[PDB]
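User: I've been trying to design a sequence by hand for this structure and keep getting stuck. Would you show me what you'd pick, starting by listing the structure so we're on the same page?

Assistant: Good idea, let's start from the same input. This is the structure you sent:
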């Protein structure tokens, strides 16, 4: 149960808040964070070639709309010890728009 998202608004959030550390396209490079291609339906810790924390790997969830919605509000609360430094997107609408963009761009 996430709010319906606007892909265009979500693309702007992604570029301004996430692209510093993440790519989305197939074959895109790892940066500080993992490439996100195939994210939806991917369990944590699965991007080929990225060195994840044990904390991320142990969370034992599948990335999809609902889990991203909670994670992105406050990453460290959801995965204590994660190496991702990002305070969170507090507004539910910003998370919804971003998630819709990610769903389209990581296919
Ligand atoms: C660099 C300062 C980051 C910013 C800004 C964002 N992310 Fe990130 N992310 C980063 C790291 C180093 C990692 C790995 C964490 C670990 O503990 O190993 C991550 C991880 C994610 C994940 C999980 C991916 C997976 O399990 O394969 C997601 C879904 C994620 N990051 C999303 C994401 C988004 C959408 C961001 C903007 C709101 C964002 N992150 C910013 C580093 C950084």
């Amino acid at each position: 149960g996430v709010p319906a998202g606007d892909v265009e608004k979500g693309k702007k959030i992604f570029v301004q808040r996430c692209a510093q550390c993440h790519t989305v396209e197939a074959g895109g490079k790892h940066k500080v964070g993992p490439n996100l291609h195939g994210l939806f339906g991917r369990k944590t810790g699965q991007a080929a070639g990225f060195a994840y924390t044990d904390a991320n790997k142990a969370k034992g969830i599948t990335w999809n709309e609902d889990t991203l919605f909670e994670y992105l509000e406050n990453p460290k609360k959801y995965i204590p010890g994660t190496k991702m430094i990002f305070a969170g997107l507090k507004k539910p609408n910003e998370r919804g728009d971003l998630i819709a963009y990610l769903k389209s761009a990581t296919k």
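That's my pick for every position. To get oriented when you compare it with your attempt: Residues 17-18, 20-22, 32-34, 44-47, 52-53, 55-56, 63, 72, 82-86, 89 surround heme C (CB under 6 Å). Helices lie at 7-17, 54-58, 65-73, 75-78, 92-105.
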